[PDB]
């Protein structure tokens, strides 16, 4: 079955490993430090 055994494995794996590296960079440099900023901003007003 297509949802069991395909043979399209290298095609799949190419698009797959690309999605992982994209999300890794995207989270790490962009979206996570923008959460860390929310925390630090709340704390800076809290400190002041």
């Amino acid at each position: 079955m297509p949802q069991l055994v395909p043979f399209y494995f290298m095609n799949q794996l190419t698009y797959g490993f690309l999605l992982m590296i994209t999300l890794l960079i995207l989270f790490s440099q962009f979206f996570l430090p923008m959460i860390l900023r929310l925390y630090v901003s709340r704390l800076f007003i809290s400190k002041l």
Partner: protein, 224 residues
Amino acid sequence: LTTFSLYTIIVLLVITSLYTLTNNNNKIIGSRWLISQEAIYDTIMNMTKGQIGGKNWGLYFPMIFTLFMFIFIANLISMIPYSFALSAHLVFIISLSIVIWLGNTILGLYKHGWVFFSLFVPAGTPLPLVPLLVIIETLSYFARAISLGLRLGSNILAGHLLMVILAGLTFNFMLINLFTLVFGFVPLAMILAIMMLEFAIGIIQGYVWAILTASYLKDAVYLH
């Protein structure tokens, strides 16, 4: 094009919207959608500070976050009825597990030299069974290799297949004689209960992934 390729794009676009369309231009007070991803951020921050807990825990805090979110979104997309999985294409998830496992094994070799095999002396134990405990630690070390991926894969694949088989039975349940059309809502409710359960076992599995490859990362970074 290719359904798999199209759905890898859908995962990326869902994740992009979750840190853009969720709050406007950063409002300190917080916006209701972003409250969720604050709590997720904190419980994985304080969890992997709890696990590996080095000074490089936060260096693997994004990595453990994108291993969470990948599995978290791809077990909502596959839950749509007319939808073609990515994660229940096992070959990507199991391959990804093997990549992380090898990247732990290499990391362990790098971090703990050729005395990496001292990891496979589990504890100080009697010397005539020290070599036995190297064999049946290493056997378990690459049983750890496939368990992590295949756990998640099996749960999601089996869940969808279970629902579909019961749906096919309930199609013919509602296409036979009227005494079977009495209590026609009860198999629908049963399939619905399984569908509720399939979300649960997928979200727990993303946490199980991320704690388990934190336990493996604990092994890889620091000896034991």
